[PDB]
Amino acid sequence: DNIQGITKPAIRRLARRGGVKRISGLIYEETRGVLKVFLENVIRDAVTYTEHAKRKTVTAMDVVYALKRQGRTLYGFGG
Amino acid sequence: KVLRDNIQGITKPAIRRLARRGGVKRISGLIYEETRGVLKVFLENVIRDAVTYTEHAKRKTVTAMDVVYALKRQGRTLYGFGG
Amino acid sequence: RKESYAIYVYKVLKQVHPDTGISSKAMSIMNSFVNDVFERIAGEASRLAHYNKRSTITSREIQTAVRLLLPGELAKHAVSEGTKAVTKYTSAK
Amino acid sequence: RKESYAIYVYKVLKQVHPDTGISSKAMSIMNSFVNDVFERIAGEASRLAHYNKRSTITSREIQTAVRLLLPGELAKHAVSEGTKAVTKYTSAK
Amino acid sequence: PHRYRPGTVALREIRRYQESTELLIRKLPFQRLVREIAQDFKTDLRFQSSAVMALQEASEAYLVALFEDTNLCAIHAKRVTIMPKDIQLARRIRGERA
Amino acid sequence: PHRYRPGTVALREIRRYQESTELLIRKLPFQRLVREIAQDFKTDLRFQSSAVMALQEASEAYLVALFEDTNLCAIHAKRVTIMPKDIQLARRIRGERA
Amino acid sequence: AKTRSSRAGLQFPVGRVHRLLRKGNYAERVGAGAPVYLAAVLEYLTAEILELAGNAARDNKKTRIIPRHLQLAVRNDEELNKLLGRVTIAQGGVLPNIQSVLLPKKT
Amino acid sequence: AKTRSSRAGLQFPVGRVHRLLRKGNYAERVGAGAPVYLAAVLEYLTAEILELAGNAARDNKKTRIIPRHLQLAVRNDEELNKLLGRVTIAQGGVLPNIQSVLLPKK
DNA sequence: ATCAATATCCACCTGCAGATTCTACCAAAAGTGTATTTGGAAACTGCTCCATCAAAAGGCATGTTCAGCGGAATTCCGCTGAACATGCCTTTTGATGGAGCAGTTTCCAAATACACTTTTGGTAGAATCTGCAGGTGGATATTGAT
DNA sequence: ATCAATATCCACCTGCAGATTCTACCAAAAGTGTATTTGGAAACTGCTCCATCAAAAGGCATGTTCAGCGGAATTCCGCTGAACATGCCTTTTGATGGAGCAGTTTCCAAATACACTTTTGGTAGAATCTGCAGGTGGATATTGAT
């Protein structure tokens, strides 16, 4: 399954950037679930903007706009 | 016709009471001054913006609505001293 | 004179609970609630319109605006009452 | 056309660090920034009108709004830059 | 000796205060704190009696919710005694200085 | 017979990655998830390549910061190992939970 | 001369909602459906919360809803609590709730 | 025809800012004093970041600014970091920082 | 585990502040009805750029081995807190002078609304330039075993 | 302290993906000038409600005493993550139809702007109504000492 696509070593690299020194084992699945919830919430709003504009193509801007209506504003993709 | 040194009026007893509503059971002794410190900062930010809306309307009386709009700017919408 | 949705909230209160009142302090809160929710939706709908180079917020904006702002089932039962008040209005002319 | 602040970001970039440049993705960030600060300041200036029941969003409001949005020193200097630019404009033909 | 063990009066207070709404900060002293802090921002100010009430309701609400996160933070270190570092962690994580 | 002690490699990795800005999750795997999740909100959709990317940047940017708080959470309980309860804690206090 | 609200089956003033929509400057023009839809949604959301409030007031043997009740209703309802996750209901107190690890005795 | 921008002495489009203000539905009327001020304020702030980002790059022996350089410049200034506290600059990485209680025992 | 000291629960009872109920004026709303204007759905289409495939690339999955982290059990010092005596200062019920918010009417400096002209920032195809990203080499600092 | 295996630095090198430069087209700006309109500052002032002094009294803060017990310090060790080298399954990179994202045109249902008519939701104010605060007492726990 795709969620397992986000691999342990990837997760290990993320945390590192966060300055993590030692990582429990369960962290990997906990991180997966959190990443999903994150995505679902974001993509849900993104796709909603899509269906409002009447397209079948999620756009950079739909994502930006979604990421905005939360206090997750993103710089570097138009808008 | 006087002065100002107000954050001791924030009594130990009152700070206890607020800790309780928060579900707190045991309080350290240094909590009291830390709390006072936190509260002040908080009051400063709101009152600062509050008074800004006041000045800007060229008034000399901080209104309920001023505090409300100020409280909204800081992500703490307050319900009900007038919508 | 300052308007408030007070009489309207009251009318509705009587619909759900015929024998229940509401203090003026609570009514005030309800008032801040209708108002707060109003701005929020109109706003999101304001933004939705510009994002699409649009000059009139219609019931279609309002809706999406409501699906983006409210949570799960709430969105759904709000969207229905939405659609339903419109459809009925629309045949009354 | 797809407007953007690219080109005014470059004219400024050159008064500060003449010999310095900036990649594409970086100019994209600075466009997003000028829009963020624009929409932010705009909005608060908008509200500032509405609260006070005024149809006009004048320079005055922009001020108060920059005073609410920007952090201390940042606002001190932004408020001045602003008053300087407005003074230099009025006192001209 | 009929003396309640420590921890029994606490839970009694927890239940007690969570059951009610009334404000926990002496009104007058809070009011001076508001006028003290405001005055040092701009002198000659006047506050509508309702303005001050809002600042309280709002401050108490904040603090109250601040403790919960604090309390959660001590329990995390395996304690029941909230300490400054707890308030401090919550404030950090919260984005109040993170 | 050469071996680095546990943590000496970690510490060098932290240094390594806080210095680079490249994405840490593999794009394909990631793009499958973005598509998999979306399929549940609307069928047969297409993504602009710059849309999936804005999505990654935001996702890792998000995750990184969270580990930061998670780590502060572990350190707070006197540990160096982050655990599930650390994340949960940082999320509850952030407001993402309850 | 029927009110627009009656035309739509609502209690909430479509006439008002509509007017506010204009003076708020959310856009150049405003559909004629917008005001109706909105008012309908507002009315629904105030009916949802009042329902819960009324109930909360019943559990406390009261006939008249007070601040505390609106709060008990909101905070006890998953969704409403989210919709008002950054709202602070004056004179509302909090949900009774003591952490598990703080209770005395064992087992 | 010697301008609005040049008149107020700015590099930022006073006319464009004024057209963006009207068309954003922020108010029924837009005084002429608003776009100028605002324009001036947008320039200043942009000069401010470029200044710091310009330095950041010098410090790394590079003449061209990238995301990496705007981030180290924004997260290292107390004020801007606050102003963009909830903003994520794509491809900006994170500031170098290792919790002391994680460094070697020495 | 039975006892004694206390706090909690809880239904009855009544003064009363806050509320549900008018009679009357109404400016501000909302609704009715042409006349005029136009935003945007709709049909058709060219140019993107997004999905798909196959070959080239390099990160990951796995099992052994053991450092060392972090939970458990033990201990005791000193802090936090329950109980209590004492009395201050917050809370309350009033009343008063007047600052200053807010309603009304006046009137012009500034903003809107076209109409006509000049410039300009954005796009597209072509050509040429360059900052620095990886690659190599050799020096040396870092870390781990003895 | 003395090697021995690695990791890190730095000075130099150069191919190229990405940034700079010049030309030419033009819809959309943005400036300019005339005519009409009006938002909200100013001057006057009604009247609300804020600052403030007064006095009494008990709620509640303050400060001390004294013991319960929580939390940090310490020793111990079971076992979980981490380092590492082995092997290839998946991702990454570059070539290609076609699905749509947009650019343009048409034109009508639907949204202004304008003149009236009518219904209504505030509210100023005198008067009656009623839920429940808060004082009371006693049945039922909930604790803590033994």
- Give yes or no for C80 touching B (CB within 8 A): no
Strand partners, H94: none
Q: Are D25 and H67 in contact (CB under 8 A)?
A: yes
Cα separation, D51 vs B70, whole angstroms:
12
Place of tokens 């470059």: D10
Cβ within 8 Å of A, F 28-87: 28-30, 32-34, 36-38, 41-42, 44-48, 50-51, 53-55, 57-60, 62-68, 70-71, 80-84, 87
How close is the nearest chain C Cα to the Cα of B82, in Å? Answer: 6
- Give the B:D interface size as CB pairs under 8 Å: 20
CA angle G97, B19, H82 (to 5 degrees): 105
Range of the domain at G1: 1-107
Cα separation, F54 vs C73, whole angstroms:
29
Q: How many CB atoms lie within 10 A of CB E13?
A: 16
Please report, for the domain that includes residue E59, its CATH number: 1.10.20.10
Helix (H) or strand (E) run with residue H65 in it: strand H64-65
For residue H26, give the chain C residue with the closest CA: C46
Cβ within 8 Å of C, G 25-84: 26-31, 33-34, 36-51, 53-54, 57-58, 63-67, 69-70, 78-80, 82-84
Please report, for the domain that includes residue G94, its CATH number: 1.10.20.10
Show me where the domains of chain D are located.
Answer: 1-93
Provide the resolution (angstroms).
3.5
* G62-93 CB burial, b ≥16 within 10 A, e <16: beebbbbbbbbbbbebeebbebbeebbbbbbb
Range of the domain at B55: 1-83
Helix (H) or strand (E) run with residue D21 in it: strand D21-22
| Interatomic distance B9 CA / J82 C1' (Å) | 55
H86 neighbourhood in chain D, CB within 8 Å? none
The residue length of chain F stands at 98
Q: What is the 3-state secondary structure (H, E, C) of chain E?
A: CCCCCCCHHHHHHHHHHHCCCCCCCCHHHHHHHHHHHHHCCCCCCEECHHHHHHHHHHHHHHHHHHHHHHHHHHHCCCCCEECHHHHHHHHHHHHHCC
Of F19, F58, F64, the CB nearest to H96: F19
Place of tokens 């003396």: E3
Domain count within chain A: 1
Q: How many CB atoms lie within 10 A of CB H29?
A: 12
Torsion angle in degrees (nearest 10) through CA of B64, B65, B67, B73: 160
Please identify, in words, the CATH class of the domain defined by C1-93. mainly alpha
Q: How many CB atoms lie within 10 A of CB E44?
A: 6
Cα separation, D58 vs G63, whole angstroms:
50
Instruction: Identify the CA nearest to H95 among candidates F12, F65, F79.
Output: F65
Q: Are G39 and G17 in contact (CB under 8 A)?
A: yes
Expt. technique: X-ray
Q: Are F24 and A13 in contact (CB under 8 A)?
A: yes
Q: What is the 3-state secondary structure (H, E, C) of F30-97?
A: HHHHHHHHHCCCCCCCEECHHHHHHHHHHHHHHHHHHHHHHHHHHHHCCCCEECHHHHHHHHHHHCCC
DSSP states of G16-81 as a string? Answer: HHHHHHHHTTS-SEE-SSHHHHHHHHHHHHHHHHHHHHHHHHHHTT-SEE-HHHHHHHHHHSHHHH
* B47-70 CB burial, b ≥16 within 10 A, e <16: bbbbbbbbbbbeeeebbbbbbbbb
Q: Are C32 and G84 in contact (CB under 8 A)?
A: no
- Give yes or no for B57 touching E (CB within 8 A): no
Cβ distance of G103 and E11 shorter than 8 Å: yes
C75, two tokens: 């969105």
The rounded radius of gyration (Å) of the Cα atoms in chain G is: 19
**Strand I reaches within 7 A of the E46 CB:** yes
Domain count within chain H: 1
Domain count within chain F: 1
The amino acid at residue E79 is R
Chains in touch with D (≥3 Cβ pairs < 8 A): A, B, G, H
Cβ distance of B62 and E45 shorter than 8 Å: yes
* Residues of chain B that touch chain D, judged by Cβ-Cβ distance less than 8 Å: 49, 52-53, 55-57, 65, 69, 73
* A10-34 CB burial, b ≥16 within 10 A, e <16: bbbbbbbbbbbbebeeebbebbbeb
Cα separation, B60 vs E42, whole angstroms:
10
Taken in order E89, E90, E91, E93, the sign of the CA dihedral is positive
Residue with minimal CA–C1' distance to J84 is: F3
Strand partners, E57: none
Strand partners, F81: A22
| Interatomic distance E16 CA / J137 C1' (Å) | 22
D69 neighbourhood in chain H, CB within 8 Å? 83
Taking the mean position of all CA atoms in its chain, how far away is CA D28?
17
